[PDB]
Amino acid sequence: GSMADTRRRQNHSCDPCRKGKRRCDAPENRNEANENGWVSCSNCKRWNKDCTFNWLSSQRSKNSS
């Protein structure tokens, strides 16, 4: 709060939106979202981008694409 503070994980928006400062429906479980019925955030579906949580992948470990 006072010492430790950063903005990265609070953003749930998928790869393309978080980059473009866009907040989407894509939760922290967009994968499970697909299972539930979701598939891609309105941004990806609107601009026909690519809904992915690569940002999430390269966090703890620099996961490649």
Quickly tell me which residue has 């400062």 as its tokens.
21
Helix (H) or strand (E) holding 43: helix 42-47
CB of 21 to Zn ion, least distance (A): 11
Among 5, 6, 14, 53, binds Zn ion (CB under 5 A): 14
30 binds Zn ion (CB under 5 A): no
Q: Is 51 in the site for Zn ion (CB under 5 A)?
A: yes
The residue type found at 9 is R
Ranges of beta strands (E only) in 1-65 are none
Binding site for Zn ion (CB under 5 A): 13-14, 17, 24, 40-41, 43-44, 51
